[PDB]
Structures are given as structure tokens and as C-alpha cells.
């Protein structure tokens, strides 16, 4: 009893927040794969009869899942068959994003490291990340750690035209056009699924005449930069590093074309990951990001000094670097 | 700058310890699968030339991994080719155990929940947990949250004979015999790999005459309880629930045979998971443990009241329940 009480207090201190985070991440990744997490919100209820039909799940199984997440404190049962997310659900979901990204999205690298160390080329084509999991976990991490800064910076500039390179479902552009009256936008993406999803979301928002979705590569902007002309802001979120070190010349031409294409006073806003930071807050997650990129994906992450030298080499007059809450994430504002 | 500073502070608060834990868990699961984590300790160095040869890894690849974990703050480079774990490595490894257990060991349940909801029997035989990952993550969780209480309780009783049901590599029995002079022990396990590993560890400790390793089932103790006779302490860590609800009668006979077999003043010490607790500290991880057991594995977790009624039904005169730091974990001491 006395020995057990001391071990209890010691063990609680040692475990800290890891049981809570471990549980949240597993429930939310499972729920997201089922399509349930998208219907969970702190300001409205999920009706199980309707959601089970929408997701093609047996309602008794959905109810048992929701009762387990209710017991966990992640949702509140309002009436029979209705559940609301807990008040701080979005922060819990944000935190879970880091765990999902390292442990789920990058799982092929965790499990097959011996293969990548022996024959990288064979391992890289065999052990491939599920890009739906990469995207969702990135979005959850971004919600509170990089997306708000990029959003507010673009809105505060009061732009007439915004171009997003690697726009995906054009969520950022739709929200910028909603806040800046009279603004136009171009959402460039090389995936058919993403451009079709962006098209339906643009139509739903009622801004098809203002927001144009184009299915093409960022690399095609080096030879064909017409879509960038007159842009007040050009945004590129965690995309440029995928062109380095193999497509460096094409990357530099895309950057020089961005500078020359901007309207006076315009800027190119790049969010990207800098390698292996030493400061206490950032170093652990910085090393995970840097190692997965360098060792497993062979994509070159640039320091702030490298990014500034590359951006000034593309003709930009001044470059500002801003620290994001996302560890190792930096926002570079390259002024024409 | 002002907007970015506010988003920085907000984002740091929202992310909290999740980037650090996410990074630690991924590096340590990757390192454990490579066999590197076993050579990491805060009180000694890992020599890369020797460890790379022992693990059959290219030394340059091992060095790059260790330099990434050094950048992360998990290890310290002492000289060239020598690395020591950070001072608090064992607490970090403990916390990582929860993430590994929910996100790695139980990954089949996360990824294939729709299958378990549609055809449980087909899913249960198709989507199977890697039991090496279940064991290692359980051990990391146990290090600071259940193993010390069980260890100290057995040692304080000053037993002449201890039996461990589901002993594995007999780590607990070896440590109890080391602290209690003249004590004997029986390590029962139904796996050949575990019994062979236990045999080599028992021989290494120099206690082959005192510790006997037996390859047989816990269920065989219901018909053949001879090995339990005269035991002062019988230990069963997270094993009894695997016999419920299908082998209930056999479980009850194993428990009644434990009571009748104990020497006077002896006790049966069971550590197990109780279902779906509501208290704030335990509820989230309790729900994850309870849901993986109930929904995915169909194993019956018993409340404290159920465990007490079952143990008193087996003839035990008094039962005490002790809260462990492991959320939802309870230690039941059933006195003869
Ligand atoms: C914003 S990027 C962020 C993740 C990044 N691709 C990575 O893993 O390093 C993801 C989105 O950009 C798109 N995308 C990726 N590479 C692209 C490229 N070179 N040109 C155009 N779109 C691209 C993808 O289709 C997806 O919608
Ligand atoms: C201590 S149990 C804890 C985990 C538990 N099996 C679970 O997943 O619910 C794991 C160890 O007990 C052994 N074991 C499991 N079931 C057993 C049984 N019925 N009889 C004997 N040993 C058993 C395994 O071989 C392993 O070494
Ligand atoms: C750094 C993350 C936001 C996304 C990323 O770059 C990746 O997962 O490859
Ligand atoms: C509760 C854990 C310690 C182990 C367990 O019961 C399992 O993983 O099945
Ligand atoms: Cl000019
Ligand atoms: Cl009696
Ligand atoms: Zn990337
Ligand atoms: Zn279990």
C-alpha cells in the first residue's frame, strides 16, 4: 500500500501525457480511416443513423466506436444516436497529427529501415507512403502550427490576385477569397483527384469565376509561367523541397519566374522545413522531419541561409524568415 | 511579424508535447526494430564499429541514424564512434511505449476496423498483431507503470517459492531471486522462443538450480497443478483475460488450484486491465485498452468488483485491489 502509493505517483509523473496522446491518436486515426472524424465537431452533433448510412457502416458498430470515444472523453453523447466532439477536440486532433505523421504516414520508413540502408533504390520503390495519410496528418499538424500564419499573412496584404503552387483542395485560396473582396486565385496541382475535389469545393463556395483550378506541375511553371503574371501573392507550402537535389535548375527557374511575374510590391510566400535545428523546443521533431526527408525520401531541406541565398539569386530584393509553431517550419516572404 | 509572433505562441501552446513524443516514438520504434535501442543506455556508450557488426548493419548508415537521434537530443556523442543515451532516456522510452502500443502493436485494428465491423471472424484471422511489437511496447509501458509495483510487492513478502504464469524471458523471477536469498522459482510459458530465451538468461544469472523454466499452457494448470504446490507467491501479468469469455471454466479451475496450492499466508498477484474507467487521468487510455480488447480481440476485461467476486469464488479469503500508474491497470493480491 505505501510502496504501491509511491510507485503510483512516480509512474504517473514518468508516463506524463503519453497515455492520453497515444489513445487520442489511435482513436482519431481509426475514426479518420472510417470517415467518422470529418463528422465530429465541438459545435454540432453527429447523428449515428445518418452517418452510418453515409459511410456505409453498420450503425451498431459505429455506436460502439462512438461509445468508446465517449468513454475516452473525446465526444459527448447528447441524446440517443447523437454525439458532439469535446470542447477542445480541434487541439487534440492537432496534437494527434504529429503522432499520425511520424507513426502512421512515415511507417514504411520505421518498419523497413534496414532495407533503405542496404539498397535505397529498391526500398524507395517498394516501401511507399500512403499519400492520403501524409495529407491528413499534415493538415492536422497545420491547423494550429502553420496554416493560420500563411492565411493571415496573405489576407493582411489585401491582394487582388493570389496563386497557390500545390493547392490540393484549394482550402487556403477559398478562405482568402472569402476574406478579401474582389480577389482572384489560381490553384495549381498535378493530381486529378485533388483538382476534381478543388473544383467541387470552389463551386460549393460560389467563386468559380474568381478561383481557377489548373491540373499541371510546378515544374511546368519554369517553361510556361503565364498563370503567375500580375499575382500579388504566390504561395508554396512544403512543395519546393521535392524538386531538390535532382531538379535544382528547374526549381531556380520557377523561383526566378515567380519574382519577375509578381505585380509591384508582391511577394512569394514559401513555407518549408529547415534541417536539424539544435534549440530545445524544436530539435526532436526537427530531427524526425530532417531524417525522414534526408535519409528515406532523399529530398534536400534547406537552412534559412540557403533559402535566402537561393531566393536573392532569383532576383528577390529582400527576404524575411518567420518562425512557425510547427517545429522546423519556416515561412519565407520573398519581396519582389 | 506581430501576427506571426501571436500565431507562434498560440501554436506552441496548442502543439504542447506532441511533436517531441511523436519524434521520440518513431526514432525508438525504428531503432528497436534495427536492434539499436537495446545497446542505448544513459550509463554507457554504444561503439558503432562493434554494434554495426553485431546487428549486421553498414556502419555509415548506423552512424547517420545515431547522428539524427543525437540532433534530436536522445543520445550524446562522446567520442568518434561512441554514443551514450541522454540522462532521461528510460523515461522517454517508457512514454514512447504507450505510442508504440496504440499506433504500432495495434495497427491492424486501426487500419482494418471496417473489416472487423463487417466480418469479425474473417478480420481476426487476417489482420493479426505482430507479437514482438506487442511484447516490446508492453515492456516499455511496464518499466515505470506496472513492473516496479509487482517486483517490490513480491520481494517484500520474502518468499521461499515464486511461480510466474506467462513468465516470458523470466526477467521478473530472475530479479526476485537476486533480491531474496534462498528463493526458488518456476517460469511457465507456452512459447518455445520465450522458454529458450528464459533458459539462456537463467543460466547467465547463475541460478539454473533455483529457477526452472517449463514450456506449457496456463490452461494445463487446471488439470495438472503440481508445479504450483507450496508457492508463497503466484504472479500472472495481463494473461488471465485471454481465457475469457470462451475458457471461463478452465480459468476458474486455474484460480481455485492457485488458492489450494499456495503455502499458508501465500498470495496470488494478478495484474490486469479493468474496462472503461471514467476518471479524468485514466479514461482516455482506459478506453483505448478496453476497445482494442473488447471490440477487436473479443477478450473480456473484468472490473475490480468482478475480479474480487471471481477470486473469492476460487476460495481466496481476502482480495486487495491496488491502483497502478498504468492507466486502467490494477494489481489484485488474493490472499489464501
Ligand atoms: C502541398 S504538397 C505538401 C507535401 C509534399 N508533396 C511532400 O510530401 O513533401 C501536397 C499537394 O501538392 C501537390 N503536388 C505535389 N508535388 C507537386 C508538383 N510538383 N506540382 C504540382 N502539385 C504538386 C499534391 O498533389 C498535393 O495535392
Ligand atoms: C505476459 S502475457 C501478456 C500479453 C497477453 N498475452 C495479451 O496480449 O493479452 C505474454 C507472455 O505470456 C505467454 N503466454 C500467453 N498466453 C499464455 C498461456 N495461456 N499460457 C502460457 N503462457 C502464455 C506468451 O508466450 C508471452 O511470453
Ligand atoms: C513536413 C510535413 C508538413 C509534410 C512533408 O513534407 C512530408 O510528409 O513529406
Ligand atoms: C495491456 C498491455 C500491457 C498488453 C495487452 O494486454 C495486449 O496488448 O493485448
Ligand atoms: Cl525590376
Ligand atoms: Cl483451507
Ligand atoms: Zn516533404
Ligand atoms: Zn491483452
Where residue B203 sits, what CATH number does that domain have?
A: 3.40.50.150
What is the Cα–Cα distance from A263 to A30, expressed in whole angstroms?
A: 46
Residue B152 neighbours by CB under 8 Å, 6+ apart:
A3, A7
Handedness of CA B42, B48, B54, B58 (dihedral sign): positive
Residue B168 and residue B252 in one domain: yes
What is the Cα–Cα distance from B63 to B69, expressed in whole angstroms?
A: 10
Residue B168 lies inside a defined structural domain of this protein: yes
Residue B164 and residue B267 in one domain: yes
Torsion-angle region of A276 (φ positive above 0: left; ψ -120 to 50: alpha; else: beta): left
The runs of H, that is alpha helices, within A169-293 are 171-179, 192-205, 248-261, 283-291
What is the Cα–Cα distance from A116 to A108, expressed in whole angstroms?
A: 10
Phi, psi at residue B256, to the nearest 5°? -65, -35
Q: How far is A267 from chain B (nearest CA, A)?
A: 15
**Quick check: CB of B291 below 6 Å from ligand 4?**
no
CATH code of A47's domain: 1.10.10
Strands in A161-165's sheet, in edge-to-edge order, are: A211-215, A184-189, A161-165, A233-237, A267-273, A329-335, A318-323
Residue A332 contacts residue A159 (beta carbons within 8 Å): no
CA of A327, nearest ligand number: 3
- Quick one: CA torsion of B131, B134, B135, B137, rounded to 10 degrees? 150
Residue B238 lies inside a defined structural domain of this protein: yes
**Quick check: CB of A273 below 6 Å from ligand 3?**
yes
In this structure, the number of other CB atoms found within 10 A of the CB of residue A199 comes to 18
In 3-state terms, what secondary structure has residue B1?
coil
The answer to whether the CB atoms of A21 and B21 lie below 8 A apart is yes
CA–CA–CA angle A206, A212, A214 (5° rounding): 140
C-alpha cell at A109: 520508413
Residue A42 lies inside a defined structural domain of this protein: yes
Residue B6 and residue B151 in one domain: no
Residue A277 contacts residue A321 (beta carbons within 8 Å): no
Domain that holds residue B191: 146-335
Phi, psi at residue B181, to the nearest 5°? -60, 140
Residue A246 lies inside a defined structural domain of this protein: yes
Query: Closest ligand 4 atom to the C-alpha of B141?
Result: 3
Residue A327 contacts residue A314 (beta carbons within 8 Å): no
Residue B311 and residue B198 in one domain: yes
Cα radius of gyration rounded to whole Å, chain A = 22
Whether the ω angle into residue B245 lies within 30 degrees of 0, i.e. cis, is yes
Residue B202 and residue B293 in one domain: yes
Residue A160 and residue A67 in one domain: no
What is the greatest pairwise CA distance in chain A? Answer: 75
Where b means 16+ CB within 10 Å and e means fewer, B196-223 reads ebbbebbeebebeebbbbeeebbeebbe
In 3-state terms, what secondary structure has residue A231?
coil
Residues of chain B in contact with residue A290, where contact means CB-CB under 8 angstroms, are 68, 71
Residue A199 and residue A311 in one domain: yes
How many beta-carbon pairs below 8 A join chains A and B? 277
**Quick check: CB of A134 below 6 Å from ligand 3?**
yes
Q: Is B11 on the interface with A (CB under 8 A)?
A: yes
The answer to whether the CB atoms of A103 and B99 lie below 8 A apart is yes
Residue B152 and residue B15 in one domain: no
CA distances in angstroms from A131 to A97, A128, A218, A247, A290, listed in the order given: 14, 9, 18, 21, 18
Q: What is the DSSP letter of B270?
A: E
Residue A127 lies inside a defined structural domain of this protein: no
Residue with cell 479524468: B280
List own/partner pairs for A3-8 with CB under 8 A and 24 or more apart: A3/B149, A3/B152, A3/B153, A3/B156, A4/B149, A4/B153, A4/B322, A4/B323, A4/B324, A4/B331, A7/B148, A7/B149, A7/B152, A7/B324, A7/B325, A8/B149, A8/B323, A8/B324, A8/B325
The answer to whether the CB atoms of A22 and B94 lie below 8 A apart is no
User: Based on the number of CB atoms within 10 Å of its own CB, is B278 exposed (0-12), middle (13-18) or buried (19 or more)?
Assistant: exposed
Q: From atom 8 of ligand 3, which residue's Cα is the shortest distance away?
A: A134
Handedness of CA B305, A66, A130, A281 (dihedral sign): negative
List own/partner pairs for A277-284 with CB under 8 A and 24 or more apart: A277/A327, A277/A328, A278/B71, A280/B73, A281/A327, A281/B12, A282/A327, A282/A328, A282/B19, A283/B71, A283/B72, A283/B73, A284/A327, A284/B19, A284/B20, A284/B23, A284/B24, A284/B72, A284/B73, A284/B74
In this structure, the number of other CB atoms found within 10 A of the CB of residue A158 comes to 13
Handedness of CA B121, B125, B127, B130 (dihedral sign): positive
CA of A237, nearest ligand number: 1
Mark which residues 112-151 of B lie under 8 Å from A by CB: 113-114, 117-118, 144-146, 148-149
What is the Cα–Cα distance from B333 to B156, expressed in whole angstroms?
A: 13
C-alpha cell at A96: 494527434
The answer to whether the CB atoms of B98 and A12 lie below 8 A apart is no
Q: From atom 8 of ligand 4, which residue's Cα is the shortest distance away?
A: B134
Residue A176 and residue A71 in one domain: no
Q: How far is A33 from chain B (nearest CA, A)?
A: 7
Strand segments, DSSP code E, in B74-229 are 75-77, 82-85, 161-165, 184-189, 211-215
Residue A138 lies inside a defined structural domain of this protein: no
CA–CA–CA angle B81, A277, B73 (5° rounding): 50
For residue B132, the CA-to-ligand 4 centroid distance in Å is 12
Q: Is B192 on the interface with A (CB under 8 A)?
A: no
Domain boundary pick from B85, B115, B133:
B85
Residue B107 lies inside a defined structural domain of this protein: no
Q: Report strand pairing: A233-237 vs A267-273.
A: parallel
What is the Cα–Cα distance from B328 to B286, expressed in whole angstroms?
A: 5
Residues of chain A in contact with residue B278, where contact means CB-CB under 8 angstroms, are 71
What is the Cα–Cα distance from A108 to A151, expressed in whole angstroms?
A: 32
What is the Cα–Cα distance from B288 to A96, expressed in whole angstroms?
A: 14
Q: From atom 13 of ligand 1, which residue's Cα is the shortest distance away?
A: A166
Residue B120 lies inside a defined structural domain of this protein: no
Residue A316 and residue A178 in one domain: yes
What is the Cα–Cα distance from A34 to A45, expressed in whole angstroms?
A: 17
Residue A69 and residue A183 in one domain: no
CA of A316, nearest ligand number: 5
Centroid of chain to Cα A102: 13
Total structural domains in chain B? 2
The answer to whether the CB atoms of A295 and B68 lie below 8 A apart is yes
For residue B121, the CA-to-ligand 8 centroid distance in Å is 18
Domain boundary pick from B69, B85, B101:
B85
From the annotation, which residues of A make up the binding site for S-adenosyl-L-methionine? 190, 218
Residue A323 and residue A214 in one domain: yes
Q: Please give the method by which this entry was determined.
A: X-ray
For residue A134, the CA-to-ligand 7 centroid distance in Å is 9
Residue A131 neighbours by CB under 8 Å, 6+ apart:
none
Domain boundary pick from A15, A50, A85:
A85
In 3-state terms, what secondary structure has residue B169?
coil
Instruction: Select the residue of B22, B107, B282 nearest A102 (Cβ to Cβ).
Output: B22
In 3-state terms, what secondary structure has residue A305?
helix
Cα radius of gyration rounded to whole Å, chain B = 22
What is the Cα–Cα distance from A113 to B102, expressed in whole angstroms?
A: 21
What is the Cα–Cα distance from A180 to A155, expressed in whole angstroms?
A: 7
Amino acid at each position: 500500500h505505501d510502496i504501491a502509493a509511491q510507485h503510483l505517483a512516480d509512474g504517473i509523473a514518468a508516463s506524463g501525457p503519453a497515455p492520453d496522446l497515444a489513445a487520442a491518436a489511435a482513436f482519431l486515426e481509426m475514426g479518420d480511416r472510417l470517415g467518422v472524424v470529418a463528422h465530429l465537431d465541438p459545435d454540432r452533433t453527429l447523428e449515428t443513423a445518418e452517418v452510418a448510412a453515409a459511410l456505409d457502416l453498420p450503425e451498431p458498430a459505429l455506436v460502439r466506436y462512438l461509445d468508446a470515444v465517449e468513454s475516452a472523453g473525446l465526444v459527448i453523447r447528447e441524446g440517443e444516436g447523437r454525439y458532439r466532439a469535446c470542447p477542445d477536440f480541434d487541439t487534440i486532433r492537432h496534437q494527434a497529427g504529429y503522432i499520425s505523421w511520424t507513426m502512421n504516414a512515415n511507417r514504411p520508413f520505421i518498419e523497413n529501415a534496414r532495407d533503405f540502408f542496404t539498397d535505397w533504390d529498391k526500398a524507395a520503390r517498394t516501401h511507399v507512403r500512403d499519400y492520403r495519410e501524409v495529407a491528413v496528418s499534415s493538415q492536422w499538424m497545420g491547423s494550429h502550427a502553420f496554416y493560420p500564419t500563411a492565411l493571415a499573412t496573405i489576407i493582411d496584404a489585401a491582394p487582388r490576385k493570389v496563386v497557390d503552387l500545390g493547392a490540393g483542395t484549394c482550402r487556403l485560396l477559398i478562405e482568402v477569397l472569402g476574406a478579401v473582396p474582389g480577389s482572384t486565385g489560381v490553384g495549381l496541382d498535378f493530381a486529378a483527384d485533388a483538382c476534381r475535389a478543388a473544383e467541387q469545393a470552389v463551386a460549393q463556395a460560389g467563386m468559380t469565376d474568381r478561383l481557377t483550378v489548373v491540373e499541371r506541375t510546378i515544374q511546368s511553371v519554369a517553361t510556361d509561367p503565364g498563370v503567375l503574371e500580375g499575382a500579388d501573392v504566390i504561395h508554396a507550402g512544403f512543395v519546393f523541397h521535392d524538386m531538390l537535389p535532382e531538379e535544382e535548375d528547374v526549381c531556380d527557374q520557377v523561383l526566378a519566374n515567380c519574382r519577375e511575374s509578381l505585380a509591384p510590391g508582391g511577394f512569394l510566400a514559401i513555407t518549408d522545413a529547415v534541417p536539424y535545428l539544435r534549440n530545445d523546443r524544436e530539435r526532436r521533431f526537427s530531427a524526425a522531419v530532417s531524417y525522414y526527408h534526408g535519409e528515406f525520401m532523399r529530398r534536400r531541406l534547406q537552412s534559412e541561409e540557403e533559402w535566402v541565398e537561393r531566393l536573392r539569386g532569383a532576383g528577390f530584393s529582400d527576404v524575411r524568415a518567420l518562425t512557425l509553431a510547427f517545429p522546423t517550419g519556416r515561412l519565407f516572404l520573398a519581396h519582389r
